[PDB]
Amino acid sequence: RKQLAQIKEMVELPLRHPALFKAIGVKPPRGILLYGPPGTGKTLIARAVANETGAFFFLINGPEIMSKLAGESESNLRKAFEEAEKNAPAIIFIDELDAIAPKREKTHGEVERRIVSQLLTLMDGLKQRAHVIVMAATNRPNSIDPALRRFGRFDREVDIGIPDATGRLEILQIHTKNMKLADDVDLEQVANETHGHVGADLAALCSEAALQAIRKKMDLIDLEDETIDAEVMNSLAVTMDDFRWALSQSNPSALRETVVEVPQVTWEDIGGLEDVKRELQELVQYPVEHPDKFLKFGMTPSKGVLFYGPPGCGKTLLAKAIANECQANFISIKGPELLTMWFGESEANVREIFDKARQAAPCVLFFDELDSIAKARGGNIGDGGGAADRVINQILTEMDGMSTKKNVFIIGATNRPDIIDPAILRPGRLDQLIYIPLPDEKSRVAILKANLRKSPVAKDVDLEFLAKMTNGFSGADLTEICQRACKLAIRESIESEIVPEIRRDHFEEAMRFARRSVSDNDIRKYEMFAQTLQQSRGF
Amino acid sequence: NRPNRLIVDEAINEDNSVVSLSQPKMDELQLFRGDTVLLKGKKRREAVCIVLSDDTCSDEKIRMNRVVRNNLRVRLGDVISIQPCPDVKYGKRIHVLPIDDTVEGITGNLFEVYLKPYFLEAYRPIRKGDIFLVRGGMRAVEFKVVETDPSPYCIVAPDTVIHCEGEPIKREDEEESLNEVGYDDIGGCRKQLAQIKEMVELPLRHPALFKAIGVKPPRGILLYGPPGTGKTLIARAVANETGAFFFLINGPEIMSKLAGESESNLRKAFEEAEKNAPAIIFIDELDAIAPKREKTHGEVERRIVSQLLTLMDGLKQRAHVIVMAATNRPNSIDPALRRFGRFDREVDIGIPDATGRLEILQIHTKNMKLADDVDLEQVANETHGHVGADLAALCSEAALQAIRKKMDLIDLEDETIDAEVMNSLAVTMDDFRWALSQSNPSALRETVVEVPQVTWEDIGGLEDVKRELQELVQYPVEHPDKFLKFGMTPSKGVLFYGPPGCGKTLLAKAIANECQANFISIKGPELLTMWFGESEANVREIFDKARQAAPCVLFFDELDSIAKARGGNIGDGGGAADRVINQILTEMDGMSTKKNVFIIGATNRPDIIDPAILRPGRLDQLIYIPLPDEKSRVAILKANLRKSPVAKDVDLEFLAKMTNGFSGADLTEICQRACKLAIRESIESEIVPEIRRDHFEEAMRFARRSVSDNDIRKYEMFAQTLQQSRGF
Amino acid sequence: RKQLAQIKEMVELPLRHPALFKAIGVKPPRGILLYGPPGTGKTLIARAVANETGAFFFLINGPEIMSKLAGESESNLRKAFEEAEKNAPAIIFIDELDAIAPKREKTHGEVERRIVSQLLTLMDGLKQRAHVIVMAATNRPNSIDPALRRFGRFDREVDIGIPDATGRLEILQIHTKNMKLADDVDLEQ
Ligand SMILES: Cc1cc2c(C(N)=O)cccc2n1-c1nc2c(c(NCc3ccccc3)n1)COCC2
Ligand SMILES: Cc1cc2c(C(N)=O)cccc2n1-c1nc2c(c(NCc3ccccc3)n1)COCC2
Ligand SMILES: Nc1ncnc2c1ncn2[C@@H]1O[C@H](COP(=O)(O)OP(=O)(O)OP(O)(O)=S)[C@@H](O)[C@H]1O
Ligand SMILES: Nc1ncnc2c1ncn2[C@@H]1O[C@H](COP(=O)(O)OP(=O)(O)OP(O)(O)=S)[C@@H](O)[C@H]1O
Ligand SMILES: Nc1ncnc2c1ncn2[C@@H]1O[C@H](COP(=O)(O)OP(=O)(O)OP(O)(O)=S)[C@@H](O)[C@H]1O
Ligand SMILES: [Mg+2]
Ligand SMILES: [Mg+2]
Ligand SMILES: [Mg+2]
């Protein structure tokens, strides 16, 4: 939705008013570069915006250029540009570009850099003259010739990520609108258990689910005829088990990367921690929702917040809770995934993970368990020197190039804040330090009312009573208690088959098998860094 | 709607023309057990068969064998009409003559050995124009009738005389030979075949049905499996047994010709399929067609890659055409071809297990009649890494050994061979024994997909962990209705820990077979030898095989091997983390909770593994394997000698009564020593063959302890206090 | 000695009885791959087993294929296979193969993988039809295209190592038989 409107801002404005641009000095768009993983819809949206404007549209994807003999491939591309000039206004769209201009460490073949030079010539000479726009699409950032990303050829780029749950909701109906659904069927719950599906994945899933429904009646009906009657087409309708069996197959097996979703946790949804709820807003909410402030008094807002404390305190959720109330998206970067993408002595994939948070403004970036990088360099005892890395210096240098007026907010999280370099803790990258203490009574009662929201828990139990005994337990312990109680209740529910509700004794058994996620000595270690922390800066 | 139409499906019985049905259809058409049934098809032809009764079957379908499928010209996915015919028929005179197209090299009388055993205990009627295939003499030959008694009135009875003439007739174009591959010529891959049966014949037998509906039919299907799995055989069968056109281009004939016409040949191979719709396209090898990877050598070879991408990208609906390709390894296909719309659906065909390998022997030795003392059961149990090609080569060379064993002394030098000695030949025990002792089993070994055969009664003891493993595996497999009414979510990972030699691999297998799931065993050192240095690139594909083979239970045997290489005993200055551990712990988090894939880890020193995989959401439940108790100690002894003639003088419970502080390795090695000493005195007495009490008595005294005592209390001090180690 | 008898088990059996294999279902051998260090005798034994059977034998080693101009090298190999079909039974022997199909980390040159694809085509299409066997020899295991070691092309391999003392005894006399030796001379020590 966000990616479409800003195309609506740069395509139809310089097309529906050709003579308006001829008098004004504003240079219209020429080149638009597309992004996104394969199957995102790089072709569908281009075809829609090229066919629903009335202007001419010409299609050349990539391979038909390299499929023909040498010599005429360049001529075809050259004529495809002059044919668009005469019938102005026109538009040009290129489906895949990564296999067209691989002017990188490959540099194989004489004829293939010829077409790269040909396209560079055909775009470099594009003065105003007529009203023509070329557009290209690709799958990864490190696949476009850097000579094409210069100003005047490809200076404006849009990143289209994997849709979230509410983004994936509309994709189901925009393809199943001709499929009338029964009363007991809804598309809401089925689009909630998935988190990495794109339009192509959902289209394939619905197609095969419909095939399953077709065969479920063709196996017993056995109607062998050429033409089919409409008296049975209308009676057919997909059921619950079809969408259940569709996802249990191998079609969800796809590629997973940084997903852009919006959180759904707000102030009433959580409880307690009034001492840090009062403070996080002071440094996030106001310099987002109050543009008039923060420049009359001078000064400048922060960019970075480092979260620290006992493990299992729910730092990721605490960071999400503030990002959704400022009308910003959220990208979750957990520790080990930034380590598995490191390989050895070659990553070359850092600069592009920050731009997605920039095009999707406003956005709140989160680094979950940043302590993973220090794990690999040196842990526990450590090496002879500092725990610095070529992946840490490159990100701490990258976060300093941004202007203070951008709304991008980076948030770090760690669990052992004594081994991280003060280099990122410098006054100007990570200024404010915020401590996450153990959950109090108001949060302990809330976590229990939240982790069983979809269970038929009887009213015989008391929610406040559990938090009354539970004092020295962390979020992991509070969750695993409920997990154990539900696990024992679900066993007796099946055993009675040889009524299905959770009773007080079910929580009572889970009470006795409780353990402590954290010890005691590490606690006072954590709140001795809280009051005296500015002393560690610089030394 | 005339409820008599039945859907055609292949039969499972390995015999002559016998059609199986269900029980409601038995009483619906008022037909008895043994009766003459009438079958009607298209092209105005009549065929007869026998209805067989079955109860353990599917809901509603017929079982249509290939012998009369060619007789009635009916393929898979068509319709068949059945009706009773209570007509009394008696056979007196039948005339049959072979065709001179396949009788080369056969001399002598062929009616007293190929027609006598085939007719007795059959009572199978015949019609005019029936094409039935018989077996015998290392080959299969079909018969055809030209003139006989007026059809029908033909029943096999001993009172029917025969007489040969000695003049074959020329075969016409009305029928086809049965020597080609059919749907019944493939065995070993059963799950992989049915889901192809779900995506090939459905969008082909109903072309106009898809034109009205909005469901997009399949276009590209990518095959997998090690070489020799059968990537060509199944494709040829599914392309030839559907009636649609099939065109073959493997890979090398494209690159063998001169530059310029190779692309033209591929371009014309696609337009020739459009006009004669419906058609199908199959590509034998693809890894050598599109190597758009670190190779990128040669100008003309990426030209054909772009040509094929162009020819598949432009494939709109139009006609009903499907392209299929096969390969040998996952890291050999151009990633540009695996996009949505070209290759989005993939099937993994692994090495068949023992019961999978059983059928491959007979589907190639059916023409080889075997003696009484020979069976194919035991010979397919000692092997674990053979595919169809390996077994075919093994049987071919075993037959050659049998041929030479009589050609060395018979010395019959003649052009044509007689059938009087072909029938007398039969392979023996020593042939299959000597076949495997040669170098033909030397092949490539990888992850094999087998089903365990150990259940609750097969093992004993450990009631405290049998009671618990089921609570977290069995119910959220066999009870789909649960685990969402109460909310919550099932687990994915279980980590096994304790003294070495406790049988953790077997304990993990015991639960996987009772939930109707396959099993893949990943032992420690094999995932280390595939690591090399700074380059593995082979992790992402080892998890998808457990996903396509749902349900499946994955097992990591001795995960502690990875920590061994990074740092052991003392350890390094930091954590024992690795780029092979982070990439798998990140991969196991991308999966949805509703998948039925279950990963199980096993270790022996659970104090040096990173808590990163022990996070609450990857490895939540921790299960301890204690020392075997009395009930398991008696069971292991009754299990490890199941194939030995142990006398009744010994007592099974008595041994477990002395044995208290011994582990599974010790319990096994005691029996190994007892058998080893008994087998020596058995041979020494030759200068009776049963195990006596003293044989176990000597093994009793030479017993050792696999584990010490101090490590024990170390193991059960982590059992009660383990949640404290999470996070620190 | 051991390596020879098992060739005696797979060459003359499917050649001296052509019509016997036509009636039975046993698939005769097609491809036989040789091994051994250079000078082991990969050519001598092939010539002996091809000349002492009466069947036709055609020789193409390796380099004459790559020595000629581009375009006719493939035609020569193609015609060398059809010339053997008409005069059945026949046999085909290739002297060196490591320099014919280097489909490995080398992958240099356009025309040289062309002949690899040509030979793969000419062997892949070999159904029963006549009684023809192709044989090839090499010097090291990591020099054959893995695509050629598949089932049906090269699935049976023999390793011929360096002969031992008693193995080396006979080699002296099989070449010095025309050299009459004195009384005080012996080839044992
Ligand atoms: C499933 C869940 C697990 C978990 C864990 C854990 N160690 O697994 C830790 C913290 C919160 C957790 N939650 C959780 N999840 C949510 C909420 C919520 N309550 C408020 C809260 C969160 C963090 C802090 C204080 C209080 N708690 C609120 O609703 C949305 C999701
Ligand atoms: C050959 C064999 C060796 C072995 C060993 C070993 N250190 O070699 C350890 C554990 C079981 C072993 N088995 C074994 N194998 C089997 C069974 C069985 N008994 C039940 C059992 C298994 C593990 C645990 C408890 C009890 N034991 C059961 O039948 C199938 C195979
Ligand atoms: N965002 C989307 N919304 C709706 N349908 C979509 C979307 N993306 C893809 N589809 C469907 O998927 C089909 C194929 O889309 P593709 O063009 O293959 O996707 P893509 O992003 O262009 O990546 P390629 O072209 O496959 S490399 C389209 O015809 C649509 O039916
Ligand atoms: N699963 C199988 N069942 C029965 N026979 C098989 C099977 N797989 C292979 N065969 C036999 O082996 C012969 C050769 O099969 P291949 O096509 O070579 O196997 P493949 O899996 O296609 O790998 P290639 O083509 O050799 S790279 C077939 O003609 C069959 O006789
Ligand atoms: N095993 C052997 N027994 C007897 N003479 C041999 C043997 N091997 C080689 N020779 C002799 O050596 C000569 C040359 O043999 P070669 O063909 O060169 O050996 P090779 O094993 O084929 O390796 P190449 O062809 O040189 S790469 C033959 O003509 C024989 O005279
Ligand atoms: Mg597209
Ligand atoms: Mg094949
Ligand atoms: Mg030589």
Side-chain angles (χ1 to χ4, degrees), chain A residues 38-39 63-64 66-70 96 98 106 108-109 111-112 139 193 195 198 200-201 207 210-212 215 218-220 222-224 226 228 233 243-245 247-250 253 256 311 336-337 339-340 343-344 379-382 454-456 477 483 486-491 493-494 500-501 515-518 522 525-526, chain B residues 1 5-7 59-60 77-79 198 202 205-206 208-210 212-213 215-216 260 263 292 295-297 299 302-303 306-307 309-310 313 336 339-340 342 344 467 470-471 475 479 482-489 534 544 547-548 550 566 573-575 582-583 585-586 590 592 594-595 616 618 720-721 723-724 726-728:
Chain A
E64 63 275 16
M66 285 74 74
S67 166
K68 41 191 68 170
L69 276 296
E96 293 177 350
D98 52 332
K106 276 178 145 146
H108 295 118
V111 294
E112 293 179 353
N139 296 129
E193 77 267 27
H195 76 99
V198 298
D201 282 285
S207 68
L211 188 153
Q212 185 48 242
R215 64 146 302 281
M218 183 66 75
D219 57 346
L220 74 164
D222 297 350
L223 185 61
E224 182 50 58
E226 284 297 318
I228 193 64
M233 294 298 102
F243 274 77
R244 278 43 165 180
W245 182 85
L247 193 147
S248 68
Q249 296 296 116
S250 307
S253 64
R256 299 286 83 80
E337 183 178 2
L339 195 64
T340 184
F343 290 160
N380 294 128
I381 296 172
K454 63 177 73 67
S455 175
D477 303 332
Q483 292 296 323
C486 192
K487 200 182 61 65
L488 295 174
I490 207 170
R491 180 176 185 78
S493 68
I494 316 166
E501 269 190 346
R515 312 293 304 176
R516 292 178 72 90
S517 73
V518 294
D522 57 340
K525 169 183 121 187
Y526 280 119
Chain B
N1 200 1
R5 307 283 96 82
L6 300 173
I7 185 66
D59 54 353
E60 197 265 324
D78 286 329
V79 70
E198 209 164 12
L202 191 142
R205 291 263 71 83
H206 301 332
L209 177 60
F210 271 62
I213 68 173
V215 179
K216 300 286 102 176
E263 297 87 11
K292 202 72 171 65
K295 276 178 145 146
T296 54
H297 295 118
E299 194 269 333
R302 47 183 90 102
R303 178 160 298 154
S306 49
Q307 174 82 89
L309 265 173
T310 308
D313 271 323
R339 311 300 175 63
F340 300 95
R342 313 160 189 168
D344 43 353
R467 181 177 181 170
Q470 63 181 182
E471 199 186 359
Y475 292 166
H479 280 112
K482 257 74 182 184
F483 287 83
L484 73 165
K485 149 191 295 213
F486 284 161
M488 71 88 59
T489 186
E534 213 63 15
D544 291 331
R547 192 168 300 114
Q548 284 100 39
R566 187 57 182 163
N582 62 355
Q583 65 183 356
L585 69 89
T586 49
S592 64
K594 193 203 165 184
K595 281 303 291 180
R618 307 187 199 98
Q720 74 282 37
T721 66
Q723 212 261 335
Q724 317 305 129
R726 313 270 82 83
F728 285 109

Side-chain angles (χ1 to χ4, degrees), chain A residues 264-265 269-271 312-314 317-318 439 443 446-447 450-451 453 475-476 479, chain B residues 616:
Chain A
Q264 284 304 321
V265 289
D269 197 12
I270 69 173
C313 281
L317 209 63
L318 189 144
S443 59
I447 305 165
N451 61 4
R453 63 170 68 255
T479 308

Side-chain angles (χ1 to χ4, degrees), chain B residues 47-89:
Chain B
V48 75
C49 190
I50 299 104
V51 169
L52 184 139
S53 301
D54 204 299
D55 293 330
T56 305
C57 57
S58 280
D59 54 353
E60 197 265 324
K61 67 171 176 91
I62 202 166
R63 290 86 184 172
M64 186 63 209
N65 191 358
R66 208 207 182 202
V67 297
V68 296
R69 260 206 294 264
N70 210 9
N71 191 12
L72 208 59
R73 310 303 191 280
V74 181
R75 285 166 147 96
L76 174 63
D78 286 329
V79 70
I80 179 63
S81 72
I82 192 167
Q83 57 153 338
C85 181
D87 185 77
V88 190
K89 310 176 187 68

Side-chain angles (χ1 to χ4, degrees), chain C residues 39 41-44 61 93 95-96:
Chain C
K42 305 166 285 297
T43 303
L44 191 61
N61 307 52
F93 160 66
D95 198 83
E96 293 177 350

Side-chain angles (χ1 to χ4, degrees), chain A residues 189-262:
Chain A
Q189 62 83 29
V190 72
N192 291 351
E193 77 267 27
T194 179
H195 76 99
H197 285 168
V198 298
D201 282 285
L202 298 176
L205 189 145
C206 83
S207 68
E208 56 91 17
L211 188 153
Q212 185 48 242
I214 293 292
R215 64 146 302 281
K216 266 195 298 299
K217 64 177 177 65
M218 183 66 75
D219 57 346
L220 74 164
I221 279 173
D222 297 350
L223 185 61
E224 182 50 58
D225 47 345
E226 284 297 318
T227 185
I228 193 64
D229 54 70
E231 281 88 357
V232 67
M233 294 298 102
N234 45 2
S235 68
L236 181 64
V238 304
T239 80
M240 307 317 95
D241 72 354
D242 288 340
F243 274 77
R244 278 43 165 180
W245 182 85
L247 193 147
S248 68
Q249 296 296 116
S250 307
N251 56 345
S253 64
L255 72 165
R256 299 286 83 80
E257 290 84 4
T258 58
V259 65
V260 193
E261 72 276 17
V262 178

